[PDB]
Amino acid sequence: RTDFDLAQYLQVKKGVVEAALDSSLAIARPEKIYEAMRYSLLAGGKRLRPILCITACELCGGDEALALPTACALEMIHTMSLIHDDLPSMDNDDFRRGKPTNHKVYGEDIAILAGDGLLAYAFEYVVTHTPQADPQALLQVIARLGRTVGAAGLVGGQVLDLESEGRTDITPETLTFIHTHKTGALLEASVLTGAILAGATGEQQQRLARYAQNIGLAFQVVDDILDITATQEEAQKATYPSLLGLEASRAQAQSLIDQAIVALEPFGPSAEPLQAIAEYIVARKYLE
Amino acid sequence: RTDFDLAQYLQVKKGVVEAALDSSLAIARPEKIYEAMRYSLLAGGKRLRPILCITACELCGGDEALALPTACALEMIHTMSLIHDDLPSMDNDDFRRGKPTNHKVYGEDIAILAGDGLLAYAFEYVVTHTPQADPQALLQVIARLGRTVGAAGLVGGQVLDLESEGRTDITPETLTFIHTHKTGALLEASVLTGAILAGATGEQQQRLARYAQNIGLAFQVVDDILDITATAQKATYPSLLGLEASRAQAQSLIDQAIVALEPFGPSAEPLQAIAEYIVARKYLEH
Numbered sequence: 001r002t003d004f005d006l007a008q009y010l011q012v013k014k015g016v017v018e019a020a021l022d023s024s025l026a027i028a029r030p031e032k033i034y035e036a037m038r039y040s041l042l043a044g045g046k047r048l049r050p051i052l053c054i055t056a057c058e059l060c061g062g063d064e065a066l067a068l069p070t071a072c073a074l075e076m077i078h079t080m081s082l083i084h085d086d087l088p089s090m091d092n093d094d095f096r097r098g099k100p101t102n103h104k105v106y107g108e109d110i111a112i113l114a115g116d117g118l119l120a121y122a123f124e125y126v127v128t129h130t131p132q133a134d135p136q137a138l139l140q141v142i143a144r145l146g147r148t149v150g151a152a153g154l155v156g157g158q159v160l161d162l163e164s165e166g167r168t169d170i171t172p173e174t175l176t177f178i179h180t181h182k183t184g185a186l187l188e189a190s191v192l193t194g195a196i197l198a199g200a201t202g203e204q205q206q207r208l209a210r211y212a213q214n215i216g217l218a219f220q221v222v223d224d225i226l227d228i229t230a231t232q233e234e235a236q237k238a239t240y241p242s243l244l245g246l247e248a249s250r251a252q253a254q255s256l257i258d259q260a261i262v263a264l265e266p267f268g269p270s271a272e273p274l275q276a277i278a279e280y281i282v283a284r285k286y287l288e
Numbered sequence: 289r290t291d292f293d294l295a296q297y298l299q300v301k302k303g304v305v306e307a308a309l310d311s312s313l314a315i316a317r318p319e320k321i322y323e324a325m326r327y328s329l330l331a332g333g334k335r336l337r338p339i340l341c342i343t344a345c346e347l348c349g350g351d352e353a354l355a356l357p358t359a360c361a362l363e364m365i366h367t368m369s370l371i372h373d374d375l376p377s378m379d380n381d382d383f384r385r386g387k388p389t390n391h392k393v394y395g396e397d398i399a400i401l402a403g404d405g406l407l408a409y410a411f412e413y414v415v416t417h418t419p420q421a422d423p424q425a426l427l428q429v430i431a432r433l434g435r436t437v438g439a440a441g442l443v444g445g446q447v448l449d450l451e452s453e454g455r456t457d458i459t460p461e462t463l464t465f466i467h468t469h470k471t472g473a474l475l476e477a478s479v480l481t482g483a484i485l486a487g488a489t490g491e492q493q494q495r496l497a498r499y500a501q502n503i504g505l506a507f508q509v510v511d512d513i514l515d516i517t518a519t520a521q522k523a524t525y526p527s528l529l530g531l532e533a534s535r536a537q538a539q540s541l542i543d544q545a546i547v548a549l550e551p552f553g554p555s556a557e558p559l560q561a562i563a564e565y566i567v568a569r570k571y572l573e574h
């Protein structure tokens with residue numbers, strides 16, 4: 001076929017990523033830890049972060065083989081964060097994607113350890129499976145992944161989110177600070193690691209970072225819009241529409257997507273798939 | 289002073305390591321996560337793994353400045369492992385080194401996350417603070433650290449240790465398999481990362497791996513001897529072998545560790561002495 005079909009693009013990339021994730025975890029002694037990591041890693045989902053990494057790598061002149069190990073590592077980090085998030089000490093969720101959570105299947109101890117194992121493996125896998133990368137670029141990917149996961153990124157965001165729970169003084173600024181850390185850091189890492197592997201300039205990286213921060217926040221604002229309008233069709237937690245109103249929330253979500261698209265215009269037409277992904281993810285949230 | 293004094297050597301290396309760990313974590317928002325990571329990282333202790341890393345790097349022709357960031361990363365990883373091990377889902381310890389455990393101070397949620405934050409920071413720190421390393425050697429250190437922590441190392445060891453509880457078929461070989469994963473991988477990583485940074489040969493690295501595996505197992509045998517002589521169900525070296533055979537095995541392992549490093553010449557004397565010193569202090573701190 002000759003016509004770019006975004007749904008098909010995303011389906012093909014998801015298939016490549018899921019085959020690589022499956023192959024990445026060969027069961028060995030002790031089999032339980034591999035089974036528990038695979039239970040969460042291979043559970044499906046959109047695979048957005050690996051897809052963003054591959055797509056940004058290609059945009060900057062790299063190839064899928066260069067990006068794929070780091071793409072897998074990003075999904076291992078994402079997966080670890082969900083395993084830890086679901087625990088009884090954290091969100092205490094029995095189900096995820098309509099299936100029992102890792103700790104409800106294997107125990108809290110095994111779930112904690114499966115998350116730790118996935119986070120360690122992300123770093124190992126980037127190095128062992130990208131021997132063709134420029135070594136200084138690969139070291140920059142490792143530094144970015146460490147910074148992204150830790151107290152200045154995802155883990156800091158998880159702490160900011162826990163601190164907000166049940167508070168009565170939440171503002172839009174407080175929510176945005178949570179989101180930039182809890183989801184924005186890892187979305188930024190997904191596009192920036194792909195770009196770094198391909199040798200992108202600082203200027204190119206700054207445009208991709210603006211794209212990633214904007215789509216991350218837009219996705220959160222849209223999720224809040226759909227939550228409050230489902231409640232319209234039907235503990236206390238403030239949301240963008242509860243704090244700002246639905247009109248202002250809708251205008252902010254649209255502005256953020258528009259700014260993400262404008263951020264990538266200077267790449268030229270090569271940026272069209274990343275620009276399309278921004279609008280597509282939002283449109284699918286409204287349809288699903 | 290002209291006499292090599294191991295205790296003084298260790299005190300000076302511990303002071304360098306502790307100053308670097310303290311400087312590594314500047315409090316920022318959210319303050320609680322930095323407070324929780326600092327609480328466990330800066331709790332003191334022997335700092336064995338960072339000191340092994342610096343000592344092995346120096347043995348192989350490297351220096352403290354080359355090794356120090358990796359040494360700090362090893363102690364961040366060690367610290368994470370203890371935070372997670374203490375949790376109510378795992379050992380459920382209220383105290384460590386006579387002080388409240390991380391989750392008793394900050395809560396289980398913050399403790400889990402402080403562990404995750406320390407493991408992430410280990411990899412960041414190694415890369416950002418070692419610009420003078422050969423980049424391929426530094427990548428080999430990163431791969432070694434990730435393999436050491438995960439399913440083929442420490443986390444696999446933690447799972448093998450849980451699986452051993454309340455079993456009747458544990459053998460000395462099965463117990464040794466637990467220990468080589470749960471503590472041996474990280475002790476081996478401590479000396480091998482220092483050696484890799486310095487450009488050690490494969491032959492040198494194989495000797496340091498033998499040293500590390502032997503001291504790690506000796507430390508575990510000695511811990512079991514001291515526990516049973518002070519006295520969830522778990523077999524131990526003395527419960528499986530008897531005390532006489534356990535004592536002979538602990539001595540043999542220390543002897544083998546010392547012999548493993550003889551071919552380096554007198555430069556290996558500090559590492560050789562650390563093996564005997566750690567055992568001697570365990571008996572004295574019993």
Ligand SMILES: C=C(C)CCOP(=O)(O)OP(=O)(O)O
Nearest residue numbers: 081082085091154158182183
């Ligand atoms: C780091 C992240 C994003 C963990 C999941 O976030 P939440 O607890 O808010 O969301 P669920 O996926 O549990 O609904």
Ligand SMILES: C=C(C)CCOP(=O)(O)OP(=O)(O)O
Nearest residue numbers: 369370373379442446470471
């Ligand atoms: C990964 C490691 C080494 C955790 C410590 O071992 P255990 O639970 O057996 O050790 P302690 O609690 O006695 O410190």
Ligand SMILES: [Mg+2]
Nearest residue numbers: 085090091161
């Ligand atoms: Mg949560």
Ligand SMILES: [Mg+2]
Nearest residue numbers: 085086091093
């Ligand atoms: Mg949750």
Ligand SMILES: [Mg+2]
Nearest residue numbers: 220223224239
């Ligand atoms: Mg929301």
Ligand SMILES: [Mg+2]
Nearest residue numbers: 265268269272
């Ligand atoms: Mg365009």
Ligand SMILES: [Mg+2]
Nearest residue numbers: 373378379449
């Ligand atoms: Mg334990």
Ligand SMILES: [Mg+2]
Nearest residue numbers: 508511512524
């Ligand atoms: Mg023991």
Ligand SMILES: [Mg+2]
Nearest residue numbers: 550553554557
């Ligand atoms: Mg000698």
